[PDB]
Amino acid sequence: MISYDNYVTILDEETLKAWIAKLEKAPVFAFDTETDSLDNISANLVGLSFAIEPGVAAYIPVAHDYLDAPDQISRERALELLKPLLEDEKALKVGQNLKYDRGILANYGIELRGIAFDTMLESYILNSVAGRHDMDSLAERWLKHKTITFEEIAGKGKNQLTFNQIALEEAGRYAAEDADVTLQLHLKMWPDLQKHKGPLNVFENIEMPLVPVLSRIERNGVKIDPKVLHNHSEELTLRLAELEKKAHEIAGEEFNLSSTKQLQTILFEKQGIKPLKKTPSTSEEVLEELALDYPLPKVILEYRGLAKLKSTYTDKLPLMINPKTGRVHTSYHQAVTATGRLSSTDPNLQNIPVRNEEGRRIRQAFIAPEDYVIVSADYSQIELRIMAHLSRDKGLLTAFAEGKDIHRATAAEVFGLPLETVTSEQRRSAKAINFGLIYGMSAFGLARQLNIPRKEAQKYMDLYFERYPGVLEYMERTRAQAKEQGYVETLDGRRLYLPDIKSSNGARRAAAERAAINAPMQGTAADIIKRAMIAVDAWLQAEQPRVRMIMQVHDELVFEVHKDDVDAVAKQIHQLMENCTRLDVPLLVEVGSGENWDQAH
Numbered sequence: 256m257i258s259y260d261n262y263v264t265i266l267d268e269e270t271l272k273a274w275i276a277k278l279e280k281a282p283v284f285a286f287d288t289e290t291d292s293l294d295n296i297s298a299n300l301v302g303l304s305f306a307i308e309p310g311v312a313a314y315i316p317v318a319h320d321y322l323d324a325p326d327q328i329s330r331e332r333a334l335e336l337l338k339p340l341l342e343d344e345k346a347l348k349v350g351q352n353l354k355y356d357r358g359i360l361a362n363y364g365i366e367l368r369g370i371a372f373d374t375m376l377e378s379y380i381l382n383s384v385a386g387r388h389d390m391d392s393l394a395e396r397w398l399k400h401k402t403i404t405f406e407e408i409a410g411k412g413k414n415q416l417t418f419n420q421i422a423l424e425e426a427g428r429y430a431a432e433d434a435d436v437t438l439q440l441h442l443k444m445w446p447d448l449q450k451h452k453g454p455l456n457v458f459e460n461i462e463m464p465l466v467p468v469l470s471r472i473e474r475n476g477v478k479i480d481p482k483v484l485h486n487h488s489e490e491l492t493l494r495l496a497e498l499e500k501k502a503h504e505i506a507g508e509e510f511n512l513s514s515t516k517q518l519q520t521i522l523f524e525k526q527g528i529k530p531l532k533k534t535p536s537t538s539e540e541v542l543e544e545l546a547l548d549y550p551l552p553k554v555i556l557e558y559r560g561l562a563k564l565k566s567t568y569t570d571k572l573p574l575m576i577n578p579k580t581g582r583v584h585t586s587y588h589q590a591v592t593a594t595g596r597l598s599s600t601d602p603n604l605q606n607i608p609v610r611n612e613e614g615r616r617i618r619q620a621f622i623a624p625e626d627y628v629i630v631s632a633d634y635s636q637i638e639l640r641i642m643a644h645l646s647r648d649k650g651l652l653t654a655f656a657e658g659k660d661i662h663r664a665t666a667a668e669v670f671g672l673p674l675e676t677v678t679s680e681q682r683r684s685a686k687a688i689n690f691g692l693i694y695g696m697s698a699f700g701l702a703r704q705l706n707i708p709r710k711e712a713q714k715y716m717d718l719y720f721e722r723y724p725g726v727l728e729y730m731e732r733t734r735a736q737a738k739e740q741g742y743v744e745t746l747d748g749r750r751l752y753l754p755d756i757k758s759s760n761g762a763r764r765a766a767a768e769r770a771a772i773n774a775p776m777q778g779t780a781a782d783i784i785k786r787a788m789i790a791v792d793a794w795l796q797a798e799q800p801r802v803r804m805i806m807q808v809h810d811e812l813v814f815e816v817h818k819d820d821v822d823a824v825a826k827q828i829h830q831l832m833e834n835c836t837r838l839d840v841p842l843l844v845e846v847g848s849g850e851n852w853d854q855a856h
């Protein structure tokens with residue numbers, strides 16, 4: 256176990272000051288905060304823990320208020336004595352998910368500096384796919400130590416206690432162990448993170464500096480109009496009713512809009528071909544093939560889609576508005592994706608349909624406050640530009656260089672015809688090839704996206720590789736080093752380990768080869784986006800203009816800018832994004848604005 260003998264519980268100023276003195280001369284120190292809620296903006300700090308050396312850690316309770324809780328240093332007195340140390344950029348701190356801790360302190364007017372090491376990110380940069388990067392998983396992987404779980408001291412279910420309700424000593428065991436373990440994890444991982452300059456570079460200049468900027472974006476939140484979302488909800492109810500009637504009217508009787516049950520009994524029973532369509536799906540959608548002529552499958556297609564969107568965003572979004580700020584605070588995850596891109600939840604901004612009309616209405620609900628406007632800064636087809644650079648292809652490089660539409664430029668080369676005459680179908684064919692290459696799509700998978708026969712798709716890809724030889728080379732070379740060293744890297748050095756590259760399993764090894772071609776372009780896009788965020792945030796902090804960075808979704812950064820400042824600010828965001836990141840890839844940033852996210856998008 257871990258008893259009350261392990262760590263000290265600081266209940267007096269004199270002892271706290273003794274520790275602050277030791278903390279001041281430590282080379283690095285682990286630090287952690289305890290609160291009464293996972294919600295950063297409204298959580299209250301219940302206590303703090305520190306670790307100066309493996310096995311030497313302490314817990315300082317400041318707001319435990321259960322019946323008869325012992326005297327504790329007051330939250331205000333503890334923070335004023337600790338403030339200088341916390342705000343000192345020279346005092347280096349180590350922590351697990353420091354983004355959270357930085358925010359809690361910000362609730363009390365404290366600016367946490369010296370945010371040097373985050374064990375979550377150390378683990379993530381070492382090997383993004385090694386497993387989960389949370390402390391409990393980390394302590395077990397690297398230290399063969401099983402940590403005290405929050406459930407162990409607080410309980411489970413609705414009757415679960417909040418930190419302020421837990422006994423001082425019990426809270427101490429948990430909090431001081433976090434600090435201690437975090438320091439031990441750093442001592443084991445930091446030395447390893449130096450065996451390679453690639454990962455070390457990404458960790459030091461991309462991931463760590465991004466920690467406080469993610470905190471600031473999350474805490475800023477985004478303005479959502481609940482009325483608009485409600486109208487959209489009422490209207491969708493009516494549209495779902497109408498659509499259901501249109502389905503019944505086309506055939507007979509009533510039925511659910513569920514395939515492999517009520518649909519096959521209608522659809523193919525009235526002429527068609529037996530198999531159904533899985534909601535596997537992004538490759539063989541039987542329902543949308545029939546949709547080009549057959550009416551029923553087209554209405555069932557649209558019905559399901561609207562049903563999904565209503566319960567996911569229309570009904571959910573209004574419930575996420577924080578009472579304290581009046582805004583929605585999404586959760587960004589910095590150590591979850593395999594390629595290094597940021598993910599998002601509650602809400603998952605990336606699942607809002609882009610090329611769909613309803614998704615546009617969801618976006619219209621993201622509004623700018625009075626006298627402000629929503630500004631969108633996007634990296635135009637960054638992955639494609641990255642592939643152009645990685646393949647060193649003069650053809651692609653020149654297309655982007657002279658500002659031509661790469662999809663029409665590619666079609667003009669593949670099909671051999673003037674750029675002005677390329678048709679929509681030809682452009683659509685080249686476009687499917689271009690994005691297919693990024694995901695390492697098979698010549699048959701391209702046929703399923705283009706609806707053309709196999710070997711006809713193969714005919715296009717051979718014509719493509721002949722016109723753009725540099726792309727085949729990159730593809731072959733990347734699969735090469737992937738087998739030679741078990742991993743692939745981005746331009747900045749970020750690595751994706753591929754354990755199934757020599758799998759001996761067929762499909763399992765195919766996946767690893769696709770990931771081999773894909774990761775370098777996706778990871779590089781990710782690195783670029785993170786560098787722009789740090790650069791834009793740095794300008795924001797230094798110059799203090801009337802602008803907030805509110806979102807990050809796909810390849811765009813969304814802001815709130817004062818209406819009278821839009822022009823100067825747009826010039827600035829634009830320069831920072833395509834000139835203060837990587838100077839090797841030919842980058843283009845498209846900046847737009849409006850009353851809501853949809854207008855600026």
Ligand SMILES: [Mg+2]
Pocket residue numbers: 651665689723
């Ligand atoms: Mg191309």
Ligand SMILES: [Mn+2]
Pocket residue numbers: 287288351352433
């Ligand atoms: Mn913590």
Ligand SMILES: [Zn+2]
Pocket residue numbers: 287288289429430433434
């Ligand atoms: Zn903790």
Ligand SMILES: [Zn+2]
Pocket residue numbers: 637638809810
């Ligand atoms: Zn993208």
Ligand SMILES: [Zn+2]
Pocket residue numbers: 829833844
């Ligand atoms: Zn420019």
